[PDB]
Design an enzyme around this catalytic site. Structure first.
Site, PDB file in Angstrom:
ATOM      1  N   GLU B 209       1.013  -1.042   0.351  1.00 32.74           N
ATOM      2  CA  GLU B 209       0.046  -0.216   0.584  1.00 32.74           C
ATOM      3  C   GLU B 209       1.254   0.852  -0.074  1.00 32.74           C
ATOM      4  O   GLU B 209       1.350   1.676   1.369  1.00 32.74           O
ATOM      5  CB  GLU B 209      -0.618  -0.364   0.963  1.00 32.74           C
ATOM      6  CG  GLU B 209      -1.832   0.718   1.054  1.00 32.74           C
ATOM      7  CD  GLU B 209      -1.378   2.229   1.966  1.00 32.74           C
ATOM      8  OE1 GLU B 209      -1.178   3.467   2.246  1.00 32.74           O
ATOM      9  OE2 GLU B 209      -2.395   2.641   2.772  1.00 32.74           O
ATOM     10  N   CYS B 243      -3.222   8.289   3.983  1.00 35.58           N
ATOM     11  CA  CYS B 243      -2.926   7.671   2.138  1.00 35.58           C
ATOM     12  C   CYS B 243      -3.953   8.130   1.407  1.00 35.58           C
ATOM     13  O   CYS B 243      -3.499   8.318   0.041  1.00 35.58           O
ATOM     14  CB  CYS B 243      -2.929   6.347   2.685  1.00 35.58           C
ATOM     15  SG  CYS B 243      -4.827   5.781   3.033  1.00 35.58           S
TER      16      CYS B 243
END
Ligand SMILES: [K+]
Ligand SMILES: [K+]
Ligand SMILES: [K+]
Ligand SMILES: [K+]
Lengths: 452, 447
Positions: B209, B243
């Site tokens: 990720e 994020c």
């Protein structure tokens, strides 16, 4: 270079949007079924030249599975491509939540030599179904099939989107500098590492189908006539050059000789007294592997066969008894018609034996005892498993195919091909309307805390 | 070394069969529930010291999601772990066909610093649920949480199966030489490549990720009062260090100043006139990142904020207007409370703009027009999408979370975590009974 231009053209054609509509993808898959029917004899000829295959086994042990995959994917494509609604919560009840499937972009398929039509075109079918451009790199080792597909693929499919890259390792190394959105490779553990390493430079996801020795545990109390005929069939098709061929047998010393005799009997029925005269018996792919495989027989106790002809790359169906686990034949993937028998005293020793080695692509067990079957599965790990048969588990649409650990990562076939060559994209679509329920989340936070 | 001995003990424990019964896995998850409840103030205190979080956002923007994941997985574990029958063919009616789930072995979770409890423990919850040993490497940037987790994890969980590896970059590099059966990493694109390269040496599958600039397209003719409160909430939580923060805005030039005014308005409601005095506003993690983010404001037109305090690593919530897409604030992931606005003249130009760049972890759009939303989705690619909100989509059990291309590969959360940390094994079980139906496959072939 030739290579950079092919990838460049393939990416530009994808960016043009032509692969998105399902109608286009179906036309291309239909062009592949037309390729298979119109080029039937060309396909047989190439497999005959490369691997000493005949008209029957070229179709029924290879080409048919490509056709059945095409037909299957065509019929399911609209369902698979549709947005997939998922379960809502009370907080999201008035929203829509779904998974949106979209292509990755340009997919690279690196084929291998042993089933050079299947292991090039069947992955390619999946990637086409998912709306990707697909660059194909055939294995040079199957020289006739490689040259044939370079010629005929552009006759049926779009020229820019689905190029074929000629050459050997240096070309493949060059090709692997190019930027792809997915790479499927079938081959060796060692090159799998090389390919993953190259993929990482562009953060490209990989599907790797790698090596291993697929064990075949034969239970003491089972019908050995049925078992050994099935084992013999899976082991000695394509002259033992199959990724999920039962590489070796694990059995109690009490039944070893009976297995030898029943393997012998079935082998006689399949290929006659002299397998060299059988249309249905294959040949080793190249001089390098003939010498490799012959080397594995040396120093072994031979119960059957054990000879070969270098000029034709024929190796007689060979069975070895009381095989040392530490000898060469039990220290590398055989990929040849040499079947070693290693002795174990129980199921439990067989499980430990399998677990002390790298995780195989396929695990086989022949047994009528349900608890033996569950126990072996529960206490081992392998790519796939078949109980009381070999090979057939990797051909069924409902069973995704792939390895684990050293036998590989990722999977494909059927729906899994479509998922593997797509990105599955989570989507939350809310109404743009004031929602009081959401105001709890905004600062300032409550000055006084409360219980959880 | 001590890293090698930890990894060895975790693998020896896994190979013993200890993690295989579901009861064992649930006991470990229940221990994690007790950890979260019993160490609430210690968690808040660590998050307060590392990131300037408070009691409320510590829980409701991080810890709660870990609890919900645990509760959800305990409840669903039997169903997920059960052998799964699949569709048969007429050729396979008398056979058993099913998918068998089994652990991968020893999983490595490399945590990150911005949500140092969630992004270490939520992945670990999934890997535990799948029956793996799980080695944990917290980020040293969030120093207090790193230290806390090293102390409290072994106090509640199996000491062999679930070790915590201390240290920084050298120790992570050392750890990456060890053989794992899966690696999950959250962090940067650049380091993601290093992780995958190390994983290839042991043929270890990875969940990555990674980074990107998550675009936020704001349609004309939509309710900007609502849109901008939502954008500001997602952008400026955790001082922009998320994020899937809406990194930048794409909008028609005709609504740029409306967007500016609505963002201001919401910022004042959230954090008051001086955000430095808000208990709900965070701070930048390190000196390096403080200087990096302040640097991004240089050369830009400040419509709001634009000041900072180096000593405490405060950066005022900052809005930038008429931003040049070639300028540095538009050439790297911002990861801070600086929101640039880039003008575009059409939906089509916005799609091209997004497609021209690397694939982002999230893509956001705000519009009251359903067709706009569908078109932007159909012609772009991102890890996930949310229309008319931000952030919320990565918290939902039914929506797998993960990236694509430069924003990553693989995914997790919910059932997908269980799948990600297990091997799904195809199983064919036939009767060992003579079958004339099969005889056509055996040689000799006919003519
Ligand atoms: K679908
Ligand atoms: K509030
Ligand atoms: K400017
Ligand atoms: K027959």
């Amino acid at each position: 270079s030739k290579i950079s231009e092919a990838v460049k053209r393939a990416r530009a054609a994808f960016s043009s949007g032509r692969t998105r509509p399902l109608q286009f993808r179906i036309q291309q898959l239909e062009a592949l079924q037309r390729l298979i029917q119109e080029q039937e004899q060309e396909l047989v000829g190439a497999l005959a030249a490369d691997l000493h295959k005949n008209e029957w086994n070229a179709y029924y042990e290879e080409v048919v599975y490509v056709l059945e995959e095409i037909e299957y994917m065509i019929q399911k494509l609209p369902e698979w491509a549709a947005d997939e609604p998922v379960e809502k919560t009370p907080q999201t009840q008035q929203d829509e939540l779904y998974i949106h499937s979209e292509p990755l972009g340009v997919v690279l398929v690196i084929g291998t030599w042993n089933y050079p039509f299947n292991l090039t075109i069947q992955p390619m079918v999946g990637a086409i179904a998912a709306g990707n451009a697909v660059v194909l790199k055939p294995s040079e080792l199957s020289e006739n099939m490689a040259s044939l597909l370079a010629t005929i693929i552009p006759q049926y499919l779009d020229k820019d989107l689905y190029p074929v890259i000629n050459g050997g390792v240096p070309e493949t190394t060059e090709l692997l500098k190019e930027r792809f959105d997915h790479i499927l490779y079938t081959g060796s553990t060692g090159v799998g590492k090389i390919i993953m390493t190259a993929a990482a430079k562009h953060l490209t996801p990989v599907t790797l189908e790698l090596g291993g020795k697929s064990p075949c545990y034969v239970d003491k109390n089972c019908d050995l006539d049925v078992a050994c005929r099935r084992i013999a069939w899976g082991k000695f098709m394509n002259s033992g050059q199959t990724c999920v061929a039962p590489d070796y047998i694990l059995c109690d010393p009490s039944i070893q000789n009976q297995i030898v005799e029943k393997l012998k009997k079935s082998l006689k029925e399949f290929y006659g007294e002299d397998a060299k005269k059988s249309r249905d018996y294959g040949r080793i792919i190249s001089a390098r592997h003939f010498q490799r495989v012959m080397g594995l027989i040396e120093g072994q106790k031979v119960a059957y066969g054990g000879t070969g002809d270098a000029a034709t790359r024929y190796i007689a169906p060979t069975i070895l008894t009381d095989v040392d686990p530490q000898s060469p034949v039990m220290q590398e993937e055989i990929f040849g018609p040499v079947l070693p028998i290693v002795c174990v005293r129980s199921l439990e020793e067989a499980i430990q034996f399998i677990n002390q080695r790298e995780k195989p692509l396929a695990l086989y067990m022949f047994s009528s005892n349900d608890k033996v079957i569950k126990k072996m599965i529960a206490e081992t790990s392998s790519g796939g498993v078949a109980a009381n048969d070999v090979i057939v588990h990797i051909t069924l649409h409902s069973l995704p195919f792939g390895g684990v650990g050293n036998s590989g990562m990722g999977s494909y076939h059927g729906k899994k091909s479509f998922e593997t060559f797509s990105h599955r994209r989570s989507c939350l679509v809310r109404p743009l309307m004031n929602d009081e329920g959401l105001k709890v989340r905004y600062p300032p936070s409550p000055a006084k805390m409360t219980q959880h």
